[PDB]
Amino acid sequence: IKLSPQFTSGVQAALAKATGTEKREALQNLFQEYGHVFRTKVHIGGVLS
Amino acid sequence: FITANSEYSESSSFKNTETEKSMYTSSRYLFPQGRIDFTTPDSGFDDV
């Protein structure tokens, strides 16, 4: 899986901040907008309960 | 030479019934399609 260029650019910009707290807040925003986990194995079908 | 008689019979009765009933039904059919997001300037994303 290739990461989308926008996410990689966001990570680079977050790590480009001057101070550690700015980096941390930028990373928090980025992962709030992009997610913290990615599903790498998924089962397809239909379930009724 | 004389006889006398008296009788007194008294009765009382009372009955009281109270009935209360309550019923409530709640049905909810929720059929989503998804979520739509708009980007706030504070997000910093180019699509805003």
Tab-separated table of N, CA, C and O in Angstrom:
chain	number	residue	atom	x	y	z
A	1	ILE	N	0.849	-1.182	0.000
A	1	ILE	CA	0.000	0.000	0.000
A	1	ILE	C	0.888	1.236	0.000
A	1	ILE	O	1.785	1.380	0.838
A	2	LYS	N	0.675	2.111	-0.974
A	2	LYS	CA	1.382	3.378	-1.031
A	2	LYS	C	0.556	4.438	-0.324
A	2	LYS	O	-0.630	4.600	-0.617
A	3	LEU	N	1.174	5.150	0.608
A	3	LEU	CA	0.476	6.230	1.283
A	3	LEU	C	0.166	7.341	0.293
A	3	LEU	O	0.951	7.617	-0.616
A	4	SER	N	-0.990	7.966	0.460
A	4	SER	CA	-1.366	9.055	-0.423
A	4	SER	C	-0.391	10.213	-0.245
A	4	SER	O	0.093	10.450	0.867
A	5	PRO	N	-0.064	10.939	-1.315
A	5	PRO	CA	0.901	12.039	-1.183
A	5	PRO	C	0.476	13.097	-0.189
A	5	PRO	O	1.336	13.695	0.469
A	6	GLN	N	-0.826	13.347	-0.054
A	6	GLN	CA	-1.291	14.366	0.879
A	6	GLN	C	-0.994	13.979	2.320
A	6	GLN	O	-0.588	14.825	3.121
A	7	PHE	N	-1.186	12.708	2.673
A	7	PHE	CA	-0.875	12.278	4.032
A	7	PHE	C	0.616	12.383	4.318
A	7	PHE	O	1.018	12.815	5.404
A	8	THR	N	1.452	11.982	3.360
A	8	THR	CA	2.893	12.085	3.550
A	8	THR	C	3.321	13.537	3.701
A	8	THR	O	4.151	13.863	4.558
A	9	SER	N	2.751	14.428	2.887
A	9	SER	CA	3.050	15.849	3.013
A	9	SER	C	2.597	16.390	4.360
A	9	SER	O	3.284	17.219	4.964
A	10	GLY	N	1.434	15.949	4.837
A	10	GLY	CA	0.991	16.356	6.158
A	10	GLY	C	1.946	15.913	7.246
A	10	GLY	O	2.245	16.672	8.169
A	11	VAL	N	2.442	14.680	7.149
A	11	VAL	CA	3.404	14.192	8.135
A	11	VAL	C	4.679	15.022	8.085
A	11	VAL	O	5.228	15.409	9.126
A	12	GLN	N	5.172	15.307	6.879
A	12	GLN	CA	6.391	16.100	6.750
A	12	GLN	C	6.204	17.497	7.321
A	12	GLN	O	7.086	18.014	8.017
A	13	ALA	N	5.064	18.127	7.036
A	13	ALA	CA	4.795	19.457	7.570
A	13	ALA	C	4.690	19.431	9.089
A	13	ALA	O	5.180	20.341	9.767
A	14	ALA	N	4.052	18.400	9.640
A	14	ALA	CA	3.954	18.278	11.089
A	14	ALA	C	5.334	18.145	11.718
A	14	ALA	O	5.627	18.773	12.739
A	15	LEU	N	6.196	17.324	11.120
A	15	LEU	CA	7.548	17.179	11.642
A	15	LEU	C	8.437	18.374	11.334
A	15	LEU	O	9.550	18.444	11.861
A	16	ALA	N	7.984	19.306	10.496
A	16	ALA	CA	8.774	20.486	10.166
A	16	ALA	C	8.571	21.635	11.145
A	16	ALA	O	9.227	22.670	10.998
A	17	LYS	N	7.675	21.488	12.115
A	17	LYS	CA	7.397	22.559	13.059
A	17	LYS	C	8.619	22.857	13.924
A	17	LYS	O	9.491	22.011	14.130
A	18	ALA	N	8.669	24.089	14.432
A	18	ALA	CA	9.847	24.547	15.162
A	18	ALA	C	10.006	23.819	16.491
A	18	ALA	O	11.088	23.313	16.806
A	19	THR	N	8.940	23.747	17.280
A	19	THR	CA	9.010	23.208	18.628
A	19	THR	C	8.274	21.879	18.718
A	19	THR	O	7.390	21.575	17.914
A	20	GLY	N	8.658	21.088	19.721
A	20	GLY	CA	8.076	19.765	19.879
A	20	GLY	C	6.574	19.798	20.083
A	20	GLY	O	5.853	18.929	19.587
A	21	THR	N	6.083	20.791	20.823
A	21	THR	CA	4.646	20.883	21.058
A	21	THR	C	3.894	21.197	19.772
A	21	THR	O	2.797	20.672	19.545
A	22	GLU	N	4.462	22.049	18.917
A	22	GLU	CA	3.835	22.310	17.625
A	22	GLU	C	3.787	21.047	16.777
A	22	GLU	O	2.772	20.763	16.129
A	23	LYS	N	4.878	20.275	16.771
A	23	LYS	CA	4.881	18.999	16.066
A	23	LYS	C	3.785	18.087	16.591
A	23	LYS	O	3.046	17.470	15.817
A	24	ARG	N	3.674	17.985	17.916
A	24	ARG	CA	2.698	17.081	18.508
A	24	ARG	C	1.277	17.505	18.171
A	24	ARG	O	0.428	16.663	17.862
A	25	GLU	N	0.994	18.807	18.223
A	25	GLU	CA	-0.354	19.268	17.914
A	25	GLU	C	-0.684	19.075	16.440
A	25	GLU	O	-1.811	18.698	16.094
A	26	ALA	N	0.283	19.326	15.554
A	26	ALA	CA	0.050	19.084	14.135
A	26	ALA	C	-0.206	17.607	13.866
A	26	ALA	O	-1.084	17.255	13.072
A	27	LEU	N	0.549	16.726	14.524
A	27	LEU	CA	0.314	15.295	14.371
A	27	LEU	C	-1.054	14.900	14.906
A	27	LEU	O	-1.734	14.049	14.323
A	28	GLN	N	-1.468	15.491	16.026
A	28	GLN	CA	-2.789	15.198	16.568
A	28	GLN	C	-3.877	15.587	15.581
A	28	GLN	O	-4.819	14.824	15.346
A	29	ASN	N	-3.758	16.773	14.985
A	29	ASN	CA	-4.733	17.185	13.982
A	29	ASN	C	-4.720	16.244	12.785
A	29	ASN	O	-5.779	15.852	12.278
A	30	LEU	N	-3.527	15.861	12.330
A	30	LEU	CA	-3.423	15.010	11.154
A	30	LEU	C	-4.064	13.652	11.390
A	30	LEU	O	-4.783	13.144	10.528
A	31	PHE	N	-3.820	13.050	12.549
A	31	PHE	CA	-4.414	11.751	12.825
A	31	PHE	C	-5.881	11.848	13.211
A	31	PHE	O	-6.606	10.860	13.082
A	32	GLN	N	-6.335	13.009	13.683
A	32	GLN	CA	-7.765	13.208	13.867
A	32	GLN	C	-8.475	13.319	12.532
A	32	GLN	O	-9.657	12.978	12.427
A	33	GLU	N	-7.782	13.803	11.509
A	33	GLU	CA	-8.407	13.939	10.203
A	33	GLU	C	-8.241	12.704	9.331
A	33	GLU	O	-9.078	12.458	8.458
A	34	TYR	N	-7.189	11.916	9.549
A	34	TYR	CA	-6.883	10.776	8.697
A	34	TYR	C	-7.124	9.429	9.353
A	34	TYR	O	-7.174	8.422	8.644
A	35	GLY	N	-7.266	9.379	10.670
A	35	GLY	CA	-7.446	8.135	11.384
A	35	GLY	C	-6.173	7.683	12.071
A	35	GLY	O	-5.064	8.130	11.772
A	36	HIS	N	-6.346	6.766	13.019
A	36	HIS	CA	-5.229	6.214	13.762
A	36	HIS	C	-4.918	4.778	13.390
A	36	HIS	O	-3.820	4.307	13.689
A	37	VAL	N	-5.843	4.077	12.740
A	37	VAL	CA	-5.640	2.692	12.344
A	37	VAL	C	-6.169	2.505	10.932
A	37	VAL	O	-6.985	3.291	10.446
A	38	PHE	N	-5.669	1.475	10.265
A	38	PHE	CA	-6.074	1.108	8.922
A	38	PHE	C	-6.363	-0.385	8.889
A	38	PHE	O	-5.604	-1.180	9.444
A	39	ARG	N	-7.453	-0.771	8.239
A	39	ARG	CA	-7.867	-2.169	8.187
A	39	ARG	C	-7.122	-2.862	7.056
A	39	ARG	O	-7.335	-2.548	5.883
A	40	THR	N	-6.262	-3.820	7.400
A	40	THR	CA	-5.461	-4.504	6.397
A	40	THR	C	-5.990	-5.882	6.030
A	40	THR	O	-5.564	-6.434	5.014
A	41	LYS	N	-6.885	-6.458	6.823
A	41	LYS	CA	-7.587	-7.673	6.433
A	41	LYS	C	-9.057	-7.500	6.759
A	41	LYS	O	-9.409	-7.270	7.916
A	42	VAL	N	-9.913	-7.631	5.752
A	42	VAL	CA	-11.341	-7.421	5.929
A	42	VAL	C	-12.090	-8.578	5.292
A	42	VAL	O	-11.658	-9.144	4.286
A	43	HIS	N	-13.207	-8.943	5.902
A	43	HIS	CA	-14.075	-9.992	5.397
A	43	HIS	C	-15.294	-9.352	4.760
A	43	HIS	O	-15.926	-8.482	5.360
A	44	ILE	N	-15.617	-9.778	3.554
A	44	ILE	CA	-16.714	-9.211	2.784
A	44	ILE	C	-17.902	-10.152	2.875
A	44	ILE	O	-17.733	-11.363	3.028
A	45	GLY	N	-19.102	-9.603	2.813
A	45	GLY	CA	-20.280	-10.449	2.806
A	45	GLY	C	-21.493	-9.688	3.305
A	45	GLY	O	-21.623	-8.488	3.078
A	46	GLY	N	-22.376	-10.423	3.970
A	46	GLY	CA	-23.561	-9.840	4.564
A	46	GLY	C	-23.973	-10.536	5.843
A	46	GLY	O	-23.976	-11.764	5.914
A	47	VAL	N	-24.333	-9.773	6.866
A	47	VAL	CA	-24.743	-10.344	8.141
A	47	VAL	C	-26.028	-9.670	8.600
A	47	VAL	O	-26.139	-8.441	8.584
A	48	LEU	N	-27.004	-10.483	8.987
A	48	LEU	CA	-28.277	-10.018	9.514
A	48	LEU	C	-28.446	-10.584	10.914
A	48	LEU	O	-28.183	-11.763	11.142
A	49	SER	N	-28.859	-9.746	11.855
A	49	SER	CA	-29.013	-10.155	13.240
A	49	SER	C	-30.373	-9.719	13.752
A	49	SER	O	-30.841	-8.623	13.436
B	1	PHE	N	-98.646	-11.355	83.404
B	1	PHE	CA	-99.707	-10.588	82.771
B	1	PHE	C	-99.276	-9.839	81.520
B	1	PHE	O	-100.145	-9.429	80.747
B	2	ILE	N	-97.977	-9.635	81.303
B	2	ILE	CA	-97.489	-8.872	80.164
B	2	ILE	C	-96.161	-9.455	79.694
B	2	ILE	O	-95.379	-9.991	80.485
B	3	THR	N	-95.936	-9.390	78.382
B	3	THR	CA	-94.666	-9.737	77.761
B	3	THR	C	-94.317	-8.675	76.728
B	3	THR	O	-95.202	-8.077	76.110
B	4	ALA	N	-93.021	-8.445	76.545
B	4	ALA	CA	-92.536	-7.462	75.589
B	4	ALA	C	-91.293	-8.002	74.900
B	4	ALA	O	-90.549	-8.808	75.464
B	5	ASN	N	-91.055	-7.518	73.682
B	5	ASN	CA	-89.951	-8.000	72.862
B	5	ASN	C	-89.439	-6.853	72.008
B	5	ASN	O	-90.202	-5.963	71.628
B	6	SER	N	-88.149	-6.903	71.689
B	6	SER	CA	-87.551	-5.929	70.788
B	6	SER	C	-86.362	-6.569	70.087
B	6	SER	O	-85.667	-7.414	70.655
B	7	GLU	N	-86.135	-6.145	68.848
B	7	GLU	CA	-85.016	-6.612	68.048
B	7	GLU	C	-84.495	-5.455	67.215
B	7	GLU	O	-85.261	-4.598	66.765
B	8	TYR	N	-83.184	-5.446	67.007
B	8	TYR	CA	-82.527	-4.426	66.202
B	8	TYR	C	-81.360	-5.081	65.486
B	8	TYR	O	-80.425	-5.551	66.139
B	9	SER	N	-81.412	-5.123	64.158
B	9	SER	CA	-80.342	-5.711	63.365
B	9	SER	C	-79.877	-4.703	62.329
B	9	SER	O	-80.678	-4.209	61.535
B	10	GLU	N	-78.583	-4.428	62.315
B	10	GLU	CA	-78.004	-3.411	61.454
B	10	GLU	C	-76.830	-4.019	60.707
B	10	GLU	O	-76.117	-4.858	61.254
B	11	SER	N	-76.634	-3.618	59.453
B	11	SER	CA	-75.526	-4.163	58.682
B	11	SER	C	-74.981	-3.104	57.741
B	11	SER	O	-75.702	-2.204	57.308
B	12	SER	N	-73.693	-3.218	57.438
B	12	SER	CA	-73.022	-2.297	56.535
B	12	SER	C	-72.067	-3.078	55.648
B	12	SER	O	-71.501	-4.087	56.066
B	13	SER	N	-71.897	-2.605	54.416
B	13	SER	CA	-71.006	-3.243	53.458
B	13	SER	C	-70.391	-2.183	52.560
B	13	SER	O	-71.021	-1.171	52.251
B	14	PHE	N	-69.160	-2.437	52.124
B	14	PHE	CA	-68.406	-1.468	51.341
B	14	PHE	C	-67.377	-2.198	50.492
B	14	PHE	O	-66.706	-3.108	50.981
B	15	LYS	N	-67.269	-1.812	49.224
B	15	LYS	CA	-66.305	-2.393	48.297
B	15	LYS	C	-65.715	-1.290	47.434
B	15	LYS	O	-66.413	-0.348	47.065
B	16	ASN	N	-64.428	-1.398	47.124
B	16	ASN	CA	-63.748	-0.364	46.355
B	16	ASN	C	-62.635	-0.967	45.516
B	16	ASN	O	-61.692	-1.537	46.060
B	17	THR	N	-62.714	-0.794	44.203
B	17	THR	CA	-61.719	-1.301	43.270
B	17	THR	C	-61.079	-0.144	42.520
B	17	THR	O	-61.774	0.756	42.046
B	18	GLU	N	-59.755	-0.175	42.411
B	18	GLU	CA	-59.005	0.807	41.639
B	18	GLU	C	-58.125	0.061	40.651
B	18	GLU	O	-57.343	-0.806	41.052
B	19	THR	N	-58.259	0.380	39.367
B	19	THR	CA	-57.466	-0.229	38.310
B	19	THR	C	-56.712	0.846	37.542
B	19	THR	O	-57.283	1.876	37.180
B	20	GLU	N	-55.430	0.592	37.293
B	20	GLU	CA	-54.571	1.459	36.498
B	20	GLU	C	-53.853	0.608	35.464
B	20	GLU	O	-53.298	-0.439	35.801
B	21	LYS	N	-53.870	1.044	34.213
B	21	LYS	CA	-53.132	0.378	33.154
B	21	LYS	C	-52.332	1.408	32.379
B	21	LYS	O	-52.751	2.555	32.223
B	22	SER	N	-51.180	0.980	31.881
B	22	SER	CA	-50.306	1.848	31.113
B	22	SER	C	-49.616	1.008	30.053
B	22	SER	O	-49.232	-0.131	30.316
B	23	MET	N	-49.487	1.562	28.855
B	23	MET	CA	-48.824	0.887	27.751
B	23	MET	C	-48.062	1.930	26.957
B	23	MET	O	-48.564	3.036	26.757
B	24	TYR	N	-46.850	1.604	26.530
B	24	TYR	CA	-46.166	2.476	25.590
B	24	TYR	C	-45.294	1.661	24.651
B	24	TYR	O	-44.628	0.711	25.065
B	25	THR	N	-45.316	2.048	23.378
B	25	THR	CA	-44.540	1.416	22.319
B	25	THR	C	-43.699	2.471	21.620
B	25	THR	O	-44.196	3.555	21.309
B	26	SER	N	-42.434	2.154	21.371
B	26	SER	CA	-41.514	3.042	20.674
B	26	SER	C	-40.807	2.254	19.587
B	26	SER	O	-40.125	1.271	19.881
B	27	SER	N	-40.962	2.683	18.340
B	27	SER	CA	-40.298	2.060	17.204
B	27	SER	C	-39.408	3.076	16.511
B	27	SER	O	-39.813	4.221	16.299
B	28	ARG	N	-38.202	2.650	16.148
B	28	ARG	CA	-37.258	3.500	15.436
B	28	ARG	C	-36.605	2.699	14.324
B	28	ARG	O	-35.967	1.675	14.586
B	29	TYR	N	-36.766	3.168	13.091
B	29	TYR	CA	-36.146	2.592	11.906
B	29	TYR	C	-35.092	3.580	11.432
B	29	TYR	O	-35.432	4.665	10.956
B	30	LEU	N	-33.825	3.210	11.558
B	30	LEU	CA	-32.705	4.069	11.194
B	30	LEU	C	-31.974	3.427	10.024
B	30	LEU	O	-31.378	2.358	10.174
B	31	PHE	N	-32.019	4.071	8.857
B	31	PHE	CA	-31.388	3.571	7.639
B	31	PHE	C	-30.383	4.617	7.187
B	31	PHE	O	-30.740	5.571	6.479
B	32	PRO	N	-29.130	4.503	7.602
B	32	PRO	CA	-28.128	5.489	7.210
B	32	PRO	C	-27.631	5.256	5.795
B	32	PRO	O	-27.852	4.211	5.185
B	33	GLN	N	-26.942	6.263	5.281
B	33	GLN	CA	-26.252	6.180	4.008
B	33	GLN	C	-24.784	6.521	4.108
B	33	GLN	O	-24.001	6.072	3.272
B	34	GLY	N	-24.394	7.292	5.099
B	34	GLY	CA	-23.018	7.688	5.254
B	34	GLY	C	-22.938	9.036	5.931
B	34	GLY	O	-23.898	9.520	6.517
B	35	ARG	N	-21.761	9.633	5.826
B	35	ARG	CA	-21.481	10.910	6.463
B	35	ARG	C	-20.790	11.833	5.477
B	35	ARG	O	-19.935	11.395	4.708
B	36	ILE	N	-21.160	13.110	5.512
B	36	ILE	CA	-20.572	14.143	4.669
B	36	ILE	C	-19.870	15.149	5.567
B	36	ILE	O	-20.442	15.602	6.563
B	37	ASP	N	-18.632	15.490	5.222
B	37	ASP	CA	-17.817	16.415	5.996
B	37	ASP	C	-17.480	17.654	5.181
B	37	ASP	O	-17.253	17.575	3.973
B	38	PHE	N	-17.455	18.796	5.857
B	38	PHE	CA	-16.909	20.036	5.334
B	38	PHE	C	-15.671	20.401	6.138
B	38	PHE	O	-15.564	20.071	7.321
B	39	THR	N	-14.736	21.087	5.496
B	39	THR	CA	-13.456	21.412	6.111
B	39	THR	C	-13.483	22.841	6.632
B	39	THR	O	-13.758	23.777	5.878
B	40	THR	N	-13.191	22.997	7.870
B	40	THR	CA	-13.064	24.218	8.643
B	40	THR	C	-11.688	24.836	8.409
B	40	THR	O	-10.702	24.116	8.243
B	41	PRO	N	-11.589	26.169	8.355
B	41	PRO	CA	-10.267	26.792	8.169
B	41	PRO	C	-9.247	26.395	9.220
B	41	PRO	O	-8.049	26.347	8.921
B	42	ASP	N	-9.682	26.124	10.452
B	42	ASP	CA	-8.752	25.687	11.486
B	42	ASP	C	-8.105	24.346	11.168
B	42	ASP	O	-7.051	24.033	11.729
B	43	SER	N	-8.712	23.541	10.294
B	43	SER	CA	-8.102	22.268	9.929
B	43	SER	C	-6.808	22.465	9.152
B	43	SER	O	-5.890	21.646	9.263
B	44	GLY	N	-6.713	23.536	8.373
B	44	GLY	CA	-5.526	23.790	7.589
B	44	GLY	C	-5.448	23.043	6.280
B	44	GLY	O	-4.423	23.134	5.598
B	45	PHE	N	-6.487	22.307	5.904
B	45	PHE	CA	-6.453	21.545	4.668
B	45	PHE	C	-6.800	22.426	3.475
B	45	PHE	O	-7.545	23.402	3.590
B	46	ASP	N	-6.251	22.064	2.315
B	46	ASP	CA	-6.364	22.924	1.142
B	46	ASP	C	-7.802	23.019	0.648
B	46	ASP	O	-8.247	24.096	0.234
B	47	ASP	N	-8.547	21.919	0.677
B	47	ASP	CA	-9.974	21.978	0.388
B	47	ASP	C	-10.665	22.521	1.628
B	47	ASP	O	-10.652	21.886	2.683
B	48	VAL	N	-11.233	23.712	1.519
B	48	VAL	CA	-11.802	24.398	2.669
B	48	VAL	C	-13.043	25.132	2.196
B	48	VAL	O	-13.116	25.571	1.045
